[PDB]
Amino acid sequence: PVARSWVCRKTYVTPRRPFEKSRLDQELKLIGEYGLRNKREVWRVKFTLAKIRKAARELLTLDEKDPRRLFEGNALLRRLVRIGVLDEGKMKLDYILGLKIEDFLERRLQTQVFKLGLAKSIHHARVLIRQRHIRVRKQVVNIPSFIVRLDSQKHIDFSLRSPYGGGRPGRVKRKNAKKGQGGAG
Amino acid sequence: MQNDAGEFVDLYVPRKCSASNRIIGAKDHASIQMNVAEVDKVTGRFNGQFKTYAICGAIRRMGESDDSILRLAKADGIVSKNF
Amino acid sequence: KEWLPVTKLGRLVKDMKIKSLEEIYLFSLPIKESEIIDFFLGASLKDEVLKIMPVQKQTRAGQRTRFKAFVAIGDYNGHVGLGVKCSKEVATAIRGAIILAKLSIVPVRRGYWGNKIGKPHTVPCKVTGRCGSVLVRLIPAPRGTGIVSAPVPKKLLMMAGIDDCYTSARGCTATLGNFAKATFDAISKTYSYLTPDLWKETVFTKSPYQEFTDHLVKTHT
Amino acid sequence: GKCRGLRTARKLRSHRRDQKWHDKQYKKAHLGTALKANPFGGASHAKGIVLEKVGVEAKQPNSAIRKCVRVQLIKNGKKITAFVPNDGCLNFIEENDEVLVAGFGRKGHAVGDIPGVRFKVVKVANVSLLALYKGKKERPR
RNA sequence: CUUUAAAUCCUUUAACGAGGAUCCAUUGGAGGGCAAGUCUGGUGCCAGCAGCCGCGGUAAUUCCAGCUCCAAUAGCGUAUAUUAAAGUUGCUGCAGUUAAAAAGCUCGUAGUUGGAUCUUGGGAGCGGCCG
């Protein structure tokens, strides 16, 4: 009898076919285009997309104008819109089945940071994110898997406590300046 | 087939047997499209128009194509009713 | 260098008095010249060999071995075909299989799953096909499901154009020839299945011969 | 299914249970004699003591004499055999040593050209055999 | 500093702290199943590899070593118990002439399953035959 959590849940499923050519090709292409550390992240994205798809199918397989169906569909569609995948003109339940994994990855913090025009390369964006360099709406962000929302899109830039956004320099510039000053005297 | 608007997505409509009301597939070479010409009542002459029939391969293979053609021609008004 | 047709259908398709092969399928005209498909279906036709089984027969002169090739060709828009050819040399066997697969292609039709919105994406019904001791059935799937099957039938279906489908096989799937023929027979009956959508009476368009006899009587003697 | 009556469930269940019981894998997994005859007794591993080293021949046209160990168990005193997997690892095993024995992996079935051997050696003298092969560790002396 | 019964842990901030950034990432494989060498050197039905087929007989792509290579990558291999694959336990949904399998035949108590036929139309109306 201890006050604990006991709640755990996986987030990925390993493909049943171990050695496939097309599957590896698509996974490698996605990792290369969007800068992923390993196949676990594309697997977790596939798992959550499959969960969303099966939930949509379960909601769709019932009759029209069912209050539970309408409530759950409206909630899920609003969640998808505020995440930033669907548009304002596509608010129908059957449009859920026509989503792509690239649509989910393009809302990643890493790729959005790379795209908005403050990092040279996507790997550069990821390494900038991981080393705590920029913030999201007056809050410092650290993890590139941050699912960026819709309203929280125009208020992300460099941080105040960063050498790039205006602040005290880092660890190498001060050391080089000290070395130069010591050499000068 | 239909859609939101109402247009057709089937790239071709297949044929259909005039006797057994069964459609004709693409790789069904036994199907026959028969043309029967009518005769003007005034004197008896060829005019230029015709009547088209279609029989699936199964009917001919089983051997009831001639009876079906006879029935179709009788119904259309070619074969005499008393016969 | 220009293609010389043999039958009068070749004359019609070469002289450009025909517009498409859809009515060729509609009238169920057999195809004997493999270049008609090339004329109609251009660079969008892709072929891929499946497997090579060296068949070996024994005689008084010792064992005799030759190769039989399986290949599937078809554009990714609704036309799919299979070809089988056996020859002494493997390369000539591949060419013959390609020619035979090009000669025999059956168009397929696709439907929707409940919500009839957009372009067709799945098999309209629960088609079936059996040859030898292999039975393959195709079940419609919602959008984005994919092609869940063995690699060879998945390749064949995605070559045909049916992106969403469910499959179920029974028997000796190890024999690639019988399994491929069964999954081709199952996909070749998607049109030959009377659906209440097609209950309308069909108007009999005149046969191409009956309309172009005035040209075929003077082209070839 | 043959009997399809709306009130025929007991007969169907009895026939199904009989046909399931008279099977092979279900019968093996649901009878006490199979586990009683198992040298381990349903355990994944079991320690033993070496009695003498023995060599065995081949079965298919694969002539190569292979060396095993005649090991006597500890829990029940059963005397079994054990194959030494890797190359030239028989020298690492001396007489009367603590050896951990595990099955080969085919569920108590002879494998390959080695007749009558269903086990293998994984640990000797509380030291892993893989470490003794790669030289990462060393057998105490 | 802060937290805390007092402390450790997390966060915050000073002062240091990286170029082969030696502040150096392993586990099983490279014949097919199953993604990856007719590479090089060594023993030659021996030593061994091998879940299966099989690889070794003086040119071994399969054994022993080096380079290269593929898979997951703070993780990977092995034994066991078990689930889907098993439409090889089949209620959905398996088979019984020749591959495993219809009692030698009939009667028969339980159990199971049982033919047809008993109810119908109009009145008024919301409305463009029928909502």
CSV table of C-alpha atoms in Angstrom, one decimal, chain B residues 31-67:
chain,number,residue,atom,x,y,z
B,31,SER,CA,-19.8,-12.7,-76.6
B,32,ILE,CA,-21.6,-11.8,-79.8
B,33,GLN,CA,-23.1,-8.5,-80.8
B,34,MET,CA,-25.6,-9.4,-83.6
B,35,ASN,CA,-27.3,-6.9,-85.9
B,36,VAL,CA,-30.7,-7.6,-87.5
B,37,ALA,CA,-32.1,-5.4,-90.2
B,38,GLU,CA,-35.8,-4.6,-90.5
B,39,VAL,CA,-37.8,-4.4,-93.7
B,40,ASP,CA,-40.2,-1.6,-94.7
B,41,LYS,CA,-43.9,-2.7,-94.9
B,42,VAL,CA,-44.8,-0.8,-98.1
B,43,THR,CA,-43.0,-3.1,-100.6
B,44,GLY,CA,-40.1,-4.9,-98.8
B,45,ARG,CA,-36.8,-3.2,-99.1
B,46,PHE,CA,-33.7,-2.4,-97.2
B,47,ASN,CA,-33.9,1.0,-95.6
B,48,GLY,CA,-30.6,1.5,-93.6
B,49,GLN,CA,-31.6,1.1,-90.0
B,50,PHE,CA,-31.0,-2.0,-87.9
B,51,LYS,CA,-31.6,-3.6,-84.5
B,52,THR,CA,-28.7,-4.7,-82.4
B,53,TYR,CA,-28.6,-7.7,-80.0
B,54,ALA,CA,-26.1,-9.0,-77.6
B,55,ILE,CA,-25.7,-12.5,-76.1
B,56,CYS,CA,-23.2,-13.5,-73.4
B,57,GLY,CA,-20.8,-16.3,-74.0
B,58,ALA,CA,-22.4,-18.6,-71.4
B,59,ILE,CA,-25.7,-18.8,-73.2
B,60,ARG,CA,-24.0,-19.8,-76.5
B,61,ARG,CA,-21.7,-22.2,-74.7
B,62,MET,CA,-24.7,-23.9,-73.1
B,63,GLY,CA,-26.6,-23.8,-76.4
B,64,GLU,CA,-29.6,-21.6,-75.9
B,65,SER,CA,-28.5,-18.6,-78.0
B,66,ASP,CA,-30.8,-19.3,-81.0
B,67,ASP,CA,-33.9,-19.6,-78.9
